[PDB]
C-alpha cells in the first residue's frame, strides 16, 4: 500500500504539503478543455480536462500541466470571463490570461484592491460574482461590505452595507432585486443594483423549523431558480420561496453543507461529509455518491458550449485532489494537484 516512499527532505516536505492541502476554488476555461484549481498555499493548478477525458490517457495526464504561485495568502475564489481568469487571493484580485497561463510567461494583467476601513487585518474576499448585462464584478468578504468594480477600468462604484458579520456567498437571478448575499450573521439579504439599497432580508435562524442552535448561525451556500432559493450552512438545508419568504421544505441531513446548486431537476450538495448529496426538489434524498475527500468545499458543473465532451461534475475540498464525475452515480477518476 505505501507505493512511493519519499526518502529525502525535499520530497518529505512535498508529501507533507500534499497531505495538508485544501482546494478552495474551481474555475473552468471559456472552452471546456481546461480546469483551474485554487490552493491553500496561494497556488493555481491548470488541468487539461479534455486530455484527461480522452481515450489516450496516461497516469501523468492527471497532473497539472501548469501550476504556479499566484497569491501570498490562500486563493478563496476564482471566476472566469470570455477571456480572463479573475482570482481573489490575499485581499486583492489578480487577472490572468487563458492564452498566456499555458505558456512560460504567466504575467498578470492588473491588480485591483478595494478601499477598506484601514484596520490591521487585510480582510479576505470569499465570493466573486461575475455580473452580465454590464461589465462588473462584485467583491464580498471580511469587510462586511459589497463592492462593485467595473471590469474595463479599475474604479469601484457601489458600496453596500447591510451585513453584521462577513459574507460567504453571492447569487444572481436576473430580476429587479437580482443579487442575494448570505453571511456569517445569519441573514440572506437582497440588493437592488439600481437604487443600491437593501430591499428584503430573510433571517433563517429566526424560523424554528430551521434553527438547529448546536451548529450556530452561518449561511454558507445560496442558489437561485429565479423564483426559489436554497439556503444552507449552519442551520439547515432549506428551500425558500422568494416574494413570500416562507420555508417550504427541509432537506434532512446532519452534516453542514458548504455548497449547493441547481441541476436540471435535482439539488446537488456537499459539505463536511464525504459524499455528494443528490436531492429531489420535493425533499427526498435521491442519492449519495462517495468522493475521495473527507470533506468537500466546491462543486462545478462544466456546462460549456463548443466542448460537449467536457461535461462533468468536479468536486474539491479538504484534500489535494479533485473528483471528476462523468456520471452521477460513481466517480470516474481524480486529478492530483
Amino acid at each position: 500500500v505505501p507505493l512511493a516512499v519519499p526518502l529525502g527532505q525535499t520530497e518529505v516536505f512535498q508529501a507533507l504539503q500534499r497531505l495538508h492541502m485544501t482546494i478552495f476554488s474551481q474555475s473552468v476555461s471559456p472552452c471546456g478543455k481546461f480546469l483551474a484549481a485554487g490552493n491553500n498555499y496561494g497556488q493555481i493548478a491548470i488541468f487539461s480536462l479534455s486530455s484527461a477525458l480522452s481515450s489516450e490517457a496516461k497516469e501523468e495526464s492527471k497532473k497539472p500541466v501548469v501550476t504556479f504561485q499566484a497569491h501570498d495568502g490562500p486563493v478563496y475564489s476564482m471566476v472566469s470571463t470570455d477571456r480572463h481568469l479573475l482570482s481573489a487571493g490575499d485581499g486583492e484580485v489578480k487577472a490572468w490570461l487563458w492564452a498566456e497561463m499555458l505558456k512560460k510567461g504567466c504575467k498578470e494583467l492588473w491588480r485591483r484592491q478595494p478601499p477598506y476601513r484601514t484596520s490591521l487585518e487585510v480582510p479576505e474576499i470569499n465570493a466573486l460574482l461575475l455580473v452580465p448585462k454590464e461589465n462588473s464584478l462584485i467583491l464580498a468578504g471580511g469587510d462586511c461590505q459589497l463592492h462593485t468594480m467595473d471590469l474595463e477600468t479599475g474604479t469601484f462604484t457601489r458600496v453596500l452595507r447591510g451585513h453584521t458579520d462577513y459574507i460567504h456567498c453571492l447569487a444572481l437571478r436576473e430580476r429587479s432585486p437580482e443579487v442575494l448575499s448570505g453571511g456569517e450573521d445569519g441573514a440572506v439579504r437582497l440588493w437592488d443594483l439600481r437604487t443600491a439599497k437593501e430591499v428584503q432580508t430573510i433571517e433563517v435562524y429566526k424560523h424554528e423549523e430551521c434553527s438547529r442552535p448546536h451548529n450556530g448561525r452561518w449561511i454558507g451556500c445560496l442558489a437561485t431558480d429565479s423564483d426559489w432559493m436554497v439556503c444552507g450552512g449552519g442551520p439547515a438545508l432549506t428551500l425558500w420561496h422568494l416574494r413570500s419568504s416562507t420555508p417550504t421544505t427541509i432537506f434532512p441531513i446532519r452534516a453542514p453543507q458548504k455548497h449547493v446548486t441547481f441541476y436540471q431537476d435535482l439539488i446537488l450538495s456537499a459539505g463536511q461529509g464525504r459524499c455528494v448529496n443528490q436531492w429531489q426538489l420535493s425533499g427526498e434524498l435521491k442519492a449519495q455518491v462517495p468522493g475521495s475527500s473527507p470533506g468537500l468545499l466546491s462543486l462545478s458543473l462544466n456546462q460549456q458550449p463548443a466542448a460537449p465532451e467536457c461535461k462533468v461534475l468536479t468536486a474539491a475540498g479538504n484534500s489535494c485532489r479533485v473528483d471528476v464525475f462523468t456520471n452521477l452515480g460513481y466517480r470516474a477518476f481524480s486529478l492530483s494537484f
Partner: protein, 147 residues
C-alpha cells in the same frame, strides 16, 4: 460528444476476457490484475445503487462491447445479474498443478458473500433469485462430480 469513462470500459472488458478463459486465473500477474479489476468493478456496482415500478410500464444475444453506451447498461438490472452470475459461475468452476493460495480462497469466500448480497439488492425479487442460484449451483456441483 458524450463524455466516456474509458478506464472502466477497458477494465470491464478485460474482466470479460478473463471470464472467457478461466485457465488464466492461476498465474501471479494475471490473478493480481483480476483482483484489482474485479474489486474495482464490484465497488462501482456497490456504489451505484440503482433502487428501481418502471418495468410494469427482438432479443439481444451477445454482449454489446461498445464504448459509447457503457451507462445505459449500468442503469439496467439484467446486465448486473448477468455479470454477477458470470462471477458466480467462475467461482464455482475454480472450486472444482492448479493449486490455490489460502489468501485467494479467503478472497473468493469474501467476494462470494458480497456477490450474493448484491444479487439480493436487485429490485425484482432478489432473495428468491439468490435462492435459485444457490440451489442451481449446488446441483451443478453434483453434476460436475459425475463427469
Amino acid at each position: 460528444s458524450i463524455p466516456i469513462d474509458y478506464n472502466l470500459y477497458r477494465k470491464f472488458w478485460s474482466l470479460q476476457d478473463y471470464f472467457r478463459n478461466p485457465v488464466q486465473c492461476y498465474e501471479k500477474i494475471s490473478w493480481k490484475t483480476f483482483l484489482k479489476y474485479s474489486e474495482e468493478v464490484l465497488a462501482v456496482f456497490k456504489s451505484y445503487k440503482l433502487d428501481d415500478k418502471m418495468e410494469e410500464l427482438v432479443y439481444f444475444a451477445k454482449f454489446l462491447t461498445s464504448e459509447k453506451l457503457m451507462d445505459l447498461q449500468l442503469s439496467d438490472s439484467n446486465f448486473r445479474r448477468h455479470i454477477l452470475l458470470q462471477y458466480l459461475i467462475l467461482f464455482q468452476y475454480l472450486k472444482g498443478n492448479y493449486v490455490l493460495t489460502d489468501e485467494q480462497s479467503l478472497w473468493i469466500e469474501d467476494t462470494t458473500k458480497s456477490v450474493y448480497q448484491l444479487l439480493s439488492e436487485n429490485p425484482p425479487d432478489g432473495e428468491r433469485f439468490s435462492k435459485m442460484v444457490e440451489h442451481i449451483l449446488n446441483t451443478e456441483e453434483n453434476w460436475n462430480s459425475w463427469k
